[PDB]
Scaffold this active site. Structure first.
Site, mmCIF file in Angstrom:
data_model
loop_
_atom_site.group_PDB
_atom_site.id
_atom_site.type_symbol
_atom_site.label_atom_id
_atom_site.label_comp_id
_atom_site.label_asym_id
_atom_site.label_seq_id
_atom_site.Cartn_x
_atom_site.Cartn_y
_atom_site.Cartn_z
ATOM 1 N N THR A 119 -18.942 -5.472 -4.568
ATOM 2 C CA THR A 119 -18.856 -4.048 -5.623
ATOM 3 C C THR A 119 -19.191 -3.172 -5.175
ATOM 4 O O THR A 119 -20.524 -3.327 -4.162
ATOM 5 C CB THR A 119 -18.743 -4.698 -6.378
ATOM 6 O OG1 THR A 119 -19.968 -3.580 -7.297
ATOM 7 C CG2 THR A 119 -19.288 -5.902 -6.975
ATOM 8 N N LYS A 144 -11.162 -13.244 -0.552
ATOM 9 C CA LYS A 144 -10.887 -12.001 -1.187
ATOM 10 C C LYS A 144 -9.932 -13.036 -2.521
ATOM 11 O O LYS A 144 -9.256 -12.704 -2.688
ATOM 12 C CB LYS A 144 -10.910 -10.879 -1.038
ATOM 13 C CG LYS A 144 -11.765 -10.213 0.268
ATOM 14 C CD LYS A 144 -11.356 -9.804 0.845
ATOM 15 C CE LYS A 144 -11.208 -7.959 1.386
ATOM 16 N NZ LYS A 144 -11.411 -7.632 2.405
ATOM 17 N N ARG A 201 0.735 -1.078 -0.149
ATOM 18 C CA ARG A 201 -0.056 -0.332 0.000
ATOM 19 C C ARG A 201 0.621 1.616 -0.105
ATOM 20 O O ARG A 201 1.815 0.819 0.782
ATOM 21 C CB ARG A 201 -0.728 0.244 1.598
ATOM 22 C CG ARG A 201 -1.899 -0.837 1.047
ATOM 23 C CD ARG A 201 -2.924 -0.936 2.088
ATOM 24 N NE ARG A 201 -3.887 -1.895 2.461
ATOM 25 C CZ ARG A 201 -4.501 -2.491 1.996
ATOM 26 N NH1 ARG A 201 -5.033 -1.768 0.971
ATOM 27 N NH2 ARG A 201 -5.209 -4.144 2.045
#
Lengths: 485, 485, 485, 485
Positions: free
Chosen positions: B290, B232, B84
């Site tokens: 989403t 995920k 990140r």
């Protein structure tokens, strides 16, 4: 469609053999020979012989069965209301194509018949038939045409085609209004006997409507309510009303010869094919009564034409074959039943069930009854688990029938407290009985013991080893997939 | 193929709603509002907030649930090992197409980031990347290209395309050998917490191989063996290894945005479609993460573009929708969950199951395990009997999952002694829990009472009247079709 | 069912783009930009602008097309008979949930409208509506309820829900008997123009019955008999009568928004899905008119929400997308059409045809007409030979349509002497025109040259190399499989 | 599956009859009787009779055919290389179960054979066989076991089972390495004759591998390249290698009896069934050579057992039946062929083609050759148009074969310039020839006249009235659906 092979065919899944008892096989010892050769059902033919004679068979069958420790079904095959000829002086009567002959309703000629004048037992024939009409005799092979009335009792006739006919043959009168009863007076008395002597099934003759089947059950009455009725389809009207007859009976018996006038010889195969599919869908058994292996009435070994004849009959879908004179009056009773067995085994080869089951399922009317939904679902489980025997606890046997209907690729083992159910299950392909003595054994609301009794059996018969799966049913509604110990 | 209509859609068969807790909804009272609106699962987002914060939520959720007399699942959504960015001085950083900028592995710039120089938490970036390589930031929407090393800590870069990016965003480095752990050190400590606090499921982040799933379970350990792992799928490698990941996990969570660099925007729908079919066949739940209905973060009523967005998501086959900021930091938490519910209900219209069930059955590997064979066969019985609810006695809930897999056209009612099982079943569409108090109630090897407890429920919820059929299961292996009293 | 991949999608098989001309794109040069970006059809919107304006477009389109050496279809999109509001003083009118307001049939207020009192062009509204009735305005988003008659011209109303509405919006009055004409007086004059100026197709508005379609053709008359009629389905009655409307029209245009009152927002997707399947079976084209990519009216790059919106629309089965304000009054006309093209290409991925063709064949009524039987059989030949392009000689183009209907997995190349047919074929997916100059070229009862003209084309477009097969049709009835030279 | 009826069966779609010529039928007049009764093919049996004898038949057949204005195929049925016994003094030899007997390779005993010592024409038998081996004689019905060598020419044997055997019977030696030629020296000379006399087809004997078929064609040579080869499958090795033999030959002839040792009598039906399906898929004709209706060698009317025998043979899928001694040496040659005809007609009842065609299509390897793709597609067109006859212009007839393969529900009419093609088409069910005189008529690159010649025929035969559709083919590749004038 179907790339077959020639290898397995295990001992179950073979068709079932019905033997007609006669002079050759009425003895306890001969019956032991029949049972050992492969007899599942002893058939009595009530168109011949006194009640005393048939009483003997019933006794003998039961004694032979008990000695061998097995359950064999006894079947009353009715004479039926079909119009018949008298008997003839010779061994027969020889009909010639050009000839003219006479037919009488006068009882005086019943025991005196000849090629020139003989008897017909329809006491009202003169009133019904008109000049120009065709009388069909002996499966409509011999055809006569009516010329005139010689008197209020005799008709003048022409022989349409050469053929030799023997004693007491079937007469068919299409194009004549003949309302024959569903049941003859002789049938009425015979059915009382059947009920009183504890027969397993009636092979009802000359059924042409579903309404007539109900008449047969009405004759059997409250005491005979557990006796199965197998319907003989013998003429056009039966074929016409088959749908209604099938799902209103307990089975169908059909014979390539004995299908009647209005079905030409070449379209007889077509009918056989249709009637077998029609029964297989409705899940009821079809008995092939056509007489193959006739040469084995005088010969120890059959002909490969007769072998292929049975093969086709089997390969097409017949669940039961029926032997007549070969077992009843033939020279080699045992050898006949032994070949049938081998042919019924070895000619089963390609018989599919994997997608065959799913086709029968798709053709039943939703919503089905709870117990039927159970049985099909259970069969479904067998293919999914790829194993390997079925144990069904059934009192009347209805549940075993329902499972067979959905043709699983494993043996079905029924566990029952009714000894009658053991017998009656002989005419269901791929199902085997295990008797559980409700009195002597006793307790099983478990229902522990009797399930184990089924598994005990399947194990000993070589179906299930340690590690195999086995599907269990107690429906009227329960199902269980069980690992073998 | 399919001549649909617009009429029924009863209360069950609606998709399931997962809500992300945040400042707007952490209160017991707000959580009561969420539960009443349709929340099945409270999701904690462990990329933010201290352990104390998440401890509070866990407490509040449990208190809200208990007060309303219901069981709501708590879900730990891990931060994950994905590389990140740091945070930026403004609200964000504004990237411009021509511009040149610098990227640092020096911790000093982590809290100081700007459009000209900012931080990336991969302390080894300098060693792995080569001039000419593309750095993809924020779901690969912003793309940078490496020009040179400014030093052993900083890279010179060009902005390939204009885009504005906010704090701590995902960095993807395809065409660079980066063996990131399956689990970050922070994940390792968070998972201990999850286990110690009795969470129901982990939403594991950045899983790209089945082997990595095992690593997550190894972290959870013996105590966490009953905690479900939802995976995920976020990058190409996950998509590549999906088959193995699916049948080795307890579910999949996917987000139209968050699918990674190597899947172009237009081929994102294609992937959604595939992954949903892939899960539906394997019978495991797929969570649509989403973010639709984003406008309802500031508005009481959504837009018909967002309504159609959810509709498609549902109509395509999603079993769970997940709400983020709308419930976590949004103005109208309740109103959002209420619309989801209505859309998840009303947009289920055409969802077939009659032949849809038979397609999933045909795609499973024969021979299936005994308990799976049982469940499918039971579903089979429902369609055959055309009725009408299912009662499944299941301890771990595995059997309820297996039945849902074979999508019956009736509600499934699970009866369980494990309170954890009640919660964990929220993420299974069309299944409802009935808790049976093993301690306080007690006896049921019957298994009388708890079956009746299921039927009692289905009756009160308006599923089954006197005369209807109901299918019952006790698998690990029993099935029963039951007439309603 | 369907284990898809993400790889090919060749240049054909992409959906077709219809562009609405307006101030941004009326110029010859802008139209050249549109054609080059992917425009297949220029759409004129006759609810706005004088005949002189539309005369200009027609001229410009033709000049742009000729300069680029291509054939572009011109489409007259009618205003239609739907009841509309007047215009408002501001940019709009702002409706508030509690408010009371007035509605007039007095022409005086048509150009003066306000949030408090505005105009409706149905001069008989007062006579039809009763207190308590709901007036639905602007796609039924704003709902009013009638309170009383203020006079023989004005109604007192309550605003049921807050919403802001702009000039001249659609009014729907279900629960009111309103027999609006199939065609308005303005439509009648516009259709004359259309005929006189040689348009290719009418996009007929507010069609609710098949009978009304015939009325449109009656207006077009003998001269307009070759002009296709595409029907707009906009309200419940159209949806109700779709079967009859489809096979009585030349196509259907539908818009997610513009589907009317009686279809709730969530069940709009359901309808889209149904109507597309319904057209695909009947083999007629379905135009998706719903406005996706709206943000590109002011922005050079769209949002991934809009990208996924188009994707779904395409992936579901739409053959044509239609752009409105984006091309008509938008900032970036070319960039919009370019993204559509890329999305229509790349989002076609999984589109099956191998078994998809055989499903459409099974659903047509046997016996089919000779020319239809020919076309399907030809498509059959393509899959059997696994190759590779189709050449169809068709005068009116009917044969090309019929082939497209049976969705082959190769490009279809139509050879035609009618220049109108070239244009009209733009709205058929996967079909390309080759014009054969009947005057200048001449002879071809061969029919040598024009077949070779097709093969010449397919070769140059990279479809067929030496050794490939190509299927040829001359139906009204001939078929040929041809080896490439 | 299949709810049949008993009604239509029009004149075409009947199976084809092959007659063996002998003393009863060699005359021109008797041959006229055969042709009129239903003979399609005259078969010569080259295991008997001099070349002069067969020269006579060829002449007579041609003269009879010409007089009746028809084309009848002449077939050379080879003797083959199978090992045979000598002849016996009596009419036969009577073998008895216990007996011991002697077998010689000494030519001296060839014309002297007896039950005690007889001859076998394999001059190397002594070297190959070992004590304990089984010699199978006369279709393996009689079985001998070898005991010892009496000398370098004679073997001591035991009779395993009682059976009576006649002159020159087939000997099979499995478990013995015997590499018999594909073609015997006598075959080699006979095949020269066949070629020189312009026969239509060879019925090759004892083919057990595809490689051996090539040997037969090599013997026929360049001049015989248009002569079809029908392969006799007679032993296990042929059955083993059938796949390769089928698609490398022009047809298969099989006989229930003559299938060899390793297929038990009961599994003979199974093989028949398999081989017929195997040919029907590959589209090549299967000739049923098994001798049914044997009783009609001495009787004017057959038995219903023989009628049902033929029925099954037909109903199962046989395209050709073959008559042996009944036509060759029987009392009633005409009456036999007339019954065959009636049975081949009337026992065709249920023969499906609607979905039967689509099953054969699904089983062919894509991509198929252009001409095959054409033919199937044409058949497709017939069902779609529900009409009604086919006209195929074919020079070698290959195209007519290909169409028959895809079993249309209408008659196929072939138009040909080769007179040989007319004859050779007799063994294709449901196809009829129309000869078009290329010399006398002349021009038809039209191809006007010869198409009309086909339609002219179909009209006169009562197939097509004004208004019916007719499908036309000129493949090697053209197809046309034509309205009848």
């Amino acid at each position: 469609l179907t790339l077959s092979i020639f290898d397995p065919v295990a001992n179950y899944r073979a068709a079932r053999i019905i033997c007609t008892i006669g002079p050759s096989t009425q003895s306890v010892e001969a019956l032991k020979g029949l049972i050992q050769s492969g007899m599942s059902v002893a058939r009595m033919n009530f168109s011949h012989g006194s009640h005393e004679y048939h009483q003997t068979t019933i006794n003998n069958v039961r004694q032979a069965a008990a000695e061998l420790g097995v359950n064999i079904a006894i079947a009353l095959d009715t004479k039926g209301p079909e119009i018949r000829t008298g008997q003839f002086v010779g061994g027969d009567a020889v009909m010639e194509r050009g000839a003219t002959c006479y037919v009488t309703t006068d009882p005086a000629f019943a025991d005196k018949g000849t090629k020139d004048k003989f008897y017909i037992d329809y006491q009202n024939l003169s009133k019904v038939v008109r000049p120009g009409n065709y009388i069909y005799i002996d499966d409509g092979i011999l055809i006569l045409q009516v010329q005139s009335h010689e008197d209020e009792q005799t008709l003048e006739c022409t022989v349409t085609n050469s053929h030799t006919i023997s004693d007491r043959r079937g007469v068919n009168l299409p194009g004549c209004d003949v309302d024959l009863p569903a049941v003859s007076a002789k049938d009425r008395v015979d059915l009382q006997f059947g009920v009183e002597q504890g027969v397993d099934m009636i092979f009802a003759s000359f059924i042409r409507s579903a309404e007539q089947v109900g008449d047969v059950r009405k004759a059997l009455g409250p005491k005979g309510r557990d006796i199965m009725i197998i319907c003989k389809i013998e003429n056009h009207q039966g074929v016409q009303n088959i749908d209604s007859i099938i799902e209103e009976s307990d089975g169908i018996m059909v014979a390539r010869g004995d299908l009647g006038v209005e079905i030409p010889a070449e379209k007889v195969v077509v009918a056989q094919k249709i009637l077998i599919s029609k029964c297989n869908v409705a899940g009821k058994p079809v008995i092939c009564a056509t007489q193959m292996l006739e040469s084995m009435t005088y010969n120890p070994r059959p002909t490969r034409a007769e072998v292929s004849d049975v093969a086709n009959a089997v390969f097409n879908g017949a669940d039961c074959v029926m032997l007549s004179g070969e077992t009843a009056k033939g020279k080699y009773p045992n050898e006949v039943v032994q070949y049938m067995a081998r042919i019924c085994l070895e000619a089963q080869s390609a018989l599919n069930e994997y997608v065959f089951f799913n086709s029968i399922k798709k053709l039943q009317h939703i919503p089905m009854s709870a117990d039927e939904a159970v049985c099909s679902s259970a069969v479904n489980s067998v293919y999914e688990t790829k194993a390997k025997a079925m144990v069904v606890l059934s009192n009347t046997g209805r549940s075993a029938r329902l499972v067979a209907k959905y043709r699983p690729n494993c043996p079905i083992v029924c566990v029952t407290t009714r000894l009658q159910t053991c017998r009656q299950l002989n005419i269901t392909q791929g199902v085997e009985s295990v008797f559980f003595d409700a009195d002597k054994l006793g307790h099983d609301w478990g229902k522990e013991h009797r399930v184990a009794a089924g598994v005990e059996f399947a194990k000993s018969k070589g179906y299930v080893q340690t590690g195999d799966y086995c599907v269990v049913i107690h429906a009227d509604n329960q199902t269980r997939i069980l690992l073998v110990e």
